[PDB]
Design a binder for these strands. Structure first.
Ligand code: NA
Ligand code: NA
Ligand code: NA
Lengths: 102, 95, 94
DNA sequence: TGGCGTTCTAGAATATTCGCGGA
DNA sequence: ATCCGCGAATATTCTAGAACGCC
């Protein structure tokens, strides 16, 4: 049985209604979160028992997701991207192979 | 020498202009952050090289501050007291 | 995984828009920085969290870059124009 | 049971700053 | 006396540890 987090993350990323806040990348091999503040307060509590980005990020790391760093970050001058080799658009069956860390 | 984080943290908490986002508790044992999103994007980059709440929280734990369990986030350190800037000398950064 | 500093420095040197301040040498085995002060105040903070030339140089030394003795020229044997793949072999000091 | 979810804190690698020492 | 390269402390980012609850 696929854990609730992966099925919920799949649904909310794929949901076109939330695409303004969280959506697939063009390749469908990663997902973006735009405006962490709005995402955390409107989307997270509709799937999880919290509205905290840190608790969402902790879960992403627990399931082998890693942050994709953009070369545009790092300067003094809101787009957060995460990926997992088995989290691909149009391949929901692949979530069976994402195993949570012990 | 007191590290920049502590003097900046004392300054921004004590600043009455920011009291709507971050301010001392009534007794002044601790400080509250209201609306993490607006605080992180509007107050943090004016003191630090980032606008991210997670890096602020990481630094707080780095200096031994702990979250008091109850958008209202409260942190305390026994040597972070309103009107006692000299006490920051006793706050130890973890190595 | 190649550290941000090396990828950013590669972009900075190779970027033709910044060539007036930082660019490859003609042979492409080193890079020059012209007007160290102006470089520090306008190009550095758009790539790093500082506008400080000393902090740019400190990281260059952390990655084994050496100053070319003769505005300001730096070199690393694996920082070569047209060989971006070589940045994988630059090790940061411990 | 034991694996999962949420929270709060810490580890690890790189980044930025300051100042110094030997050449 | 100057200056390049470096040690060390702090800063920022991303990931992980640890405690506890709960079906
Ligand atoms: Na979506
Ligand atoms: Na304040
Ligand atoms: Na250039």
């Amino acid at each position: 049985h696929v854990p609730a987090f992966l099925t919920k993350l799949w649904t909310l990323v794929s949901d076109p209604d939330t695409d303004a806040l969280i959506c697939w990348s063009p390749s469908g091999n990663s997902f973006h979160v735009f405006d962490q503040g709005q995402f955390a307060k409107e989307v997270l509590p509709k799937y999880f028992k919290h509205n905290n980005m840190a608790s969402f990020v902790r879960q992403l790391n627990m399931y082998g997701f890693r942050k994709v760093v953009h070369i545009e970050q790092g300067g003094l001058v809101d787009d957060t991207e995460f990926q997992h080799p088995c989290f691909l658009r149009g391949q929901e069956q692949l979530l069976e192979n994402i195993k949570r860390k012990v």
